[PDB]
Amino acid sequence: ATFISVQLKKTSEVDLAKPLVKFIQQTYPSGGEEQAQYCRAAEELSKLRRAAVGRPLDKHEGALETLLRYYDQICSIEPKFPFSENQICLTFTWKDAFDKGSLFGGSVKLALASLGYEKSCVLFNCAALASQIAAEQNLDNDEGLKIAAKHYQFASGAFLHIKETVLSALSREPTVDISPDTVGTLSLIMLAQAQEVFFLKATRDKMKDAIIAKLANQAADYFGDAFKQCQYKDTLPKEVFPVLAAKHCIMQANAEYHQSILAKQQYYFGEEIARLQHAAELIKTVASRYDEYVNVKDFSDKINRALAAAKKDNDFIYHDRVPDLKDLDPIGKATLVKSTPVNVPISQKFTDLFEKMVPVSVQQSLAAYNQRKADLVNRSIAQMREATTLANGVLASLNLPAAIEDVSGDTVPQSILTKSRSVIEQGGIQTVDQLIKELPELLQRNREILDESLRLLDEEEATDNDLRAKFKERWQRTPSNELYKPLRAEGTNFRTVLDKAVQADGQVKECYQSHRDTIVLLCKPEPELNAAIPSANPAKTMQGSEVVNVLKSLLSNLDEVKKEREGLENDLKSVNFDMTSKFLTALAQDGVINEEALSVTELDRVYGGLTTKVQESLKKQEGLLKNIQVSHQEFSKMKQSNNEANLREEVLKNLATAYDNFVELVANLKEGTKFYNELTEILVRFQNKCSDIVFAR
């Protein structure tokens, strides 16, 4: 008995672990569980590749499951780690299986940086090992038949899934062994051999000759088509070709011998003889020409015994005419066999070591959701602040609401009194003065950290350069200059950040000293404050003036509008939607993730109720300011201009402006502080990254 199998492809060993670990750590928070279990996984993955591929040796189902295990695992990894985005220099190198190319060689290799290459090759080896296990089977035996029939149909299916898979993965020309045409021929050889096994099972089980003829004819159909595919392309080892031809003939002769036993049974005697004669011719021919590859004697003895016995009976008794082959009905065909679809998992007891890991597709949708959400929220905050700033400025330049609460010109208007006490409560000028004083100190701290860090790199570099000059032979590591350039680039980066911060300190210093004194007044206790604001005569027709009640009410609703901006801002900030689960769904039920359309509709459900109100705020402000200014323009006409109330008038406008400035400055000075504090965080880490690289070197 002789069946075709395929030899395994050889690979060079490659470290799977360390290029994958580089990513894992750059993805998740260092020193955590979501980074612990994945490094334990990527190293066991590297080991598994070694057991699956590292040696072409073992030859039974123990080593096959390990190969299948590896196939399934590699297919499970793909949607995680970013392979569909070329930048990992994990490059796989395989040899052609058959020592075959489209050039005059002895061997040919292909190194490729692709998982699609890795998985075609593993699959091919899965297929090939399966073919070898099948060929080894004892076909006298019911477990043998069965294991052979299942392995050939596996190989055929694996070979065929490679055929439909190679090109779109392998963005190159594949080695001959894994190219569509070869792999389509291998698939058909494996299917033909499965049919062969089923023909043997039916024979062993003493099934009807009509069934056996049809299973054998079908096997011949498969073998003939594979033979034909080989006739004008030599891509398989040298033995494949004549074995296909012999097996094609043997399966025809079998078809004919069984159909002959059918003709006899039906008393078609000349037909028995013509079919036996054909069987004999085919087998005579197989024995002379393919003697090296098959043994066919028993079958030939059996044909001859049948032929002689049938010719004795015909010549003496029946006198039936022997027809020509061309006038005989075709024997039918019956396939019992199929190419096994490839569907991960193909191994028994499979578990994805990286199942818990989130697909890359989701990150580049979860991080992208963030940049759209952030755009929307900041945008909204900024619009509102910029609006409130503009309203307060307009109000101040019109002495509102002070003017309308200014009964005489003798006391502190209630609103200025409210703002004053509000400034005093927040600590008065002491709080601004203290924050101004420490801003140069939080700057200096950060400069010290950046500078101490770069000094380190410099020190180490100097001694490294001096050791290379003196101990040329004893001292050859890559220079410090080169190891350090990545860190030195973060260095000059941080420098740029610190400069923009200094410029920002400028704006805040200039503002603070330009507004200090008026603020100091606003913070004085109420009787003292009153004495410093000039008195004036009331323009007494401010009883229940209608131009006043309108201004009062317009200003009240403008107030309403700006207090409402605070809750809007806080709710804009306090809410969030975790979007992972949505993306999980969109990916598991559909092909890919369409984040653009999916996030926009979610941002609209979560933030729409708020972005609506924010836009309604601006328009409402625009309405209010327009007719506040046409209403004031009338109000000023009624109450005249002398210098006693002009002076009081400026002092009041300037006191309202002082309040806006205390408020703007406290906030700028806190933004400054937080910035300079969070920058010490980032820079302490940087100091450690520098001391670590100088301690290892």
């Binding site: 950040v497 923009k500 911060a501 920002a504 704006q507 805040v508 400054g672 969070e678 980032i682």
Partner: peptide
């Protein structure tokens, strides 16, 4: 923007 909270956050 006053202080470079943009540069700081992406770091």
């Amino acid at each position: 923007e006053l202080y470079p909270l943009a540069s700081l956050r992406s770091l």
